[PDB]
């Protein structure tokens, strides 16, 4: 019990770059626009189903 609590205290307080505001940039499935985040006419597409992901990237802006 003291050993498992010691390993919890050991690998709990570690690591660097603790800047947690976006662990993953957008979503894996998300198509991030090039002028996203800044002032433009930047338009998001909320499609249904990941099998629709074909041809979305190809002829979008």
């Amino acid at each position: 019990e003291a050993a498992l609590a010691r390993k919890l205290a050991a690998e709990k307080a570690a690591e660097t770059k603790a800047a947690k505001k976006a662990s993953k940039a957008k979503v894996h499935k998300h198509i991030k626009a090039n002028l996203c985040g800044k002032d433009a006419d930047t338009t998001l597409f909320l499609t249904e189903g990941d099998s629709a992901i074909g041809y979305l990237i190809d002829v979008r802006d």
């Binding site: 099998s51 629709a52 992901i53 074909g54 041809y55 990237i57 190809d58």
Partner: protein, 50 residues
Amino acid sequence: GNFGSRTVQKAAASRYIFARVSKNFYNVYKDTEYAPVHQDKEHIPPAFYL
């Protein structure tokens, strides 16, 4: 239907997809009644085609 592109590789499920024989089959495959019939009786296709 949707068949993907160069940029995506995982094809979708069967539920949106229609298919039919192409003409290029008929360009390169002909005379298929002479195909060598397979040694198993319930192997209803032959060994191979022409």
